[PDB]
Design a protein around this ligand. Sequence first.
Ligand SMILES: Cc1cc2nc3c(=O)[nH]c(=O)nc-3n(C[C@H](O)[C@H](O)[C@H](O)COP(=O)(O)OP(=O)(O)OC[C@H]3O[C@@H](n4cnc5c(N)ncnc54)[C@H](O)[C@@H]3O)c2cc1C
Ligand SMILES: [Cl-]
Length: 488
Amino acid sequence: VKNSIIWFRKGLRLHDNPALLEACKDAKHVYPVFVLDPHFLQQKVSVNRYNFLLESLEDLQRSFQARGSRLLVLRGKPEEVFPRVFREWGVTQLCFEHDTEPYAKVRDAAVRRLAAEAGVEVVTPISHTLYDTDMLVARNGGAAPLTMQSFTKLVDRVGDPPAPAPDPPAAMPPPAEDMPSAAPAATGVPTWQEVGFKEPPLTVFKGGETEALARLEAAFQDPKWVAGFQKPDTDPSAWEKPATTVLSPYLKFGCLSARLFHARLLEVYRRHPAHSQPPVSLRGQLLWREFFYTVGSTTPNFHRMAGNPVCKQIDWDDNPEFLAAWREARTGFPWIDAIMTQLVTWGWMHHLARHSVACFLTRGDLYVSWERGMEVFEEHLIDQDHYLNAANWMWLSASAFFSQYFRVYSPVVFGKKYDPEGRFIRKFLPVLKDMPAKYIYEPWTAPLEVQRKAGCVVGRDYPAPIVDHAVASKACIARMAAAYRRSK
Ligand SMILES: Cc1cc2nc3c(=O)[nH]c(=O)nc-3n(C[C@H](O)[C@H](O)[C@H](O)COP(=O)(O)OP(=O)(O)OC[C@H]3O[C@@H](n4cnc5c(N)ncnc54)[C@H](O)[C@@H]3O)c2cc1C
Ligand SMILES: [Cl-]
């Protein structure tokens, strides 16, 4: 008889889950398993993202319970847990979604070895990406495209991605009864207090497949807005109603299927002939995700500078004071400090907001390595994706994919073209709420009488700017030009 395990790591969803569909096929018992390392924090991870993962697991639990099953959160390491439950549960098949991250290949290789010893068939379908990214590389001649222009030509030659997989049955083969490793007291979903965190999460985005599908429909309520979507023209200062979909955390954890997102975009596109095209279109945004996954999975040391064949070697400054001020949102520039405050409170900022603070830290003002900025994003972003965070940090630092280092965002002017009153600033930096809009982006320029009348004296309640942008930007551009000339 067939007893199987569906191992959740990413792909925290029931829709478009070919691994789950194969696990339930002709199965007498199915064990939905997520492996939680209980000492993960005691070894980096904000409570905002970890609680998002936990809320995503609670959503899977309810979905399984509605179908007569149960989600099993096993404590420990996969290499130590699976060899035990293979014998205990009489497992004949192990199914999980393919993952191309560096740690994933080392972990999946070991588990695959352990399954062959126990006589367990391993099925690893691809469903986290639009395509089999290794197939894209093989069709391009054995190397991934290095520009979006050529990558879009490749996917158009390959054709449409696979359709979303059908929904699982309304009743699933259940786990066996009175199995010791499946005891409810040892397999339940923990809370954020139970894992070790002490401060509560403050983000307004809730995890889970149910929330992902709800945000998908909300985005498609206006098909005209989807058809004409142009990413560079969206508003980074919009926070009450974000200017983009905010589907990144759900695609990162696999709460939302990328193939379902793509399939519903094409339905809209067939009825709107003048729809936007890549790379600015909403579909083009999924291709940015696919493109960075394709290059990252085939590039060694893609998440670093040294040993990275696609990354340019720039001698970034080792400046802990600039890094600390940027990380703690005390740069003296309200536009920059507000985005960093949204980072630690929400764990999500608009794409152009991430452009502003990443340029400021790297090639724009402070000249700190993009690796240090990536480590700060990795801690707080609820959508932190190994390949996307690294690639976009190399883009903004002009270390790869992007080379126009003369385009430098102003920490003053960039925000006031969208938000002259500075509602985004007043929201996340309440200390500046009573500051007149004439000085909200440059509060040091406000006369002392206005600073006192607003209850925000620069140097006492809000710090002075750490650098003069005109001086600092002119220095970074000169050093970037020297770094490029030396990298022939
Ligand atoms: C320094 C920096 C770091 C970033 N780190 C991350 C990260 O860790 N995780 C992450 O998901 N994105 C990251 N991005 C990309 C981008 O800023 C976010 O994907 C975007 O803000 C998500 O909002 P949205 O879901 O509303 O996007 P939409 O515009 O609605 O796009 C829809 C989806 O397309 C994908 N997408 C959109 N823009 C990009 C892009 N530039 N690169 C790759 N995929 C994209 C995402 O999956 C996103 O959910 C980073 C960008 C910068 C500049
Ligand atoms: Cl600008």
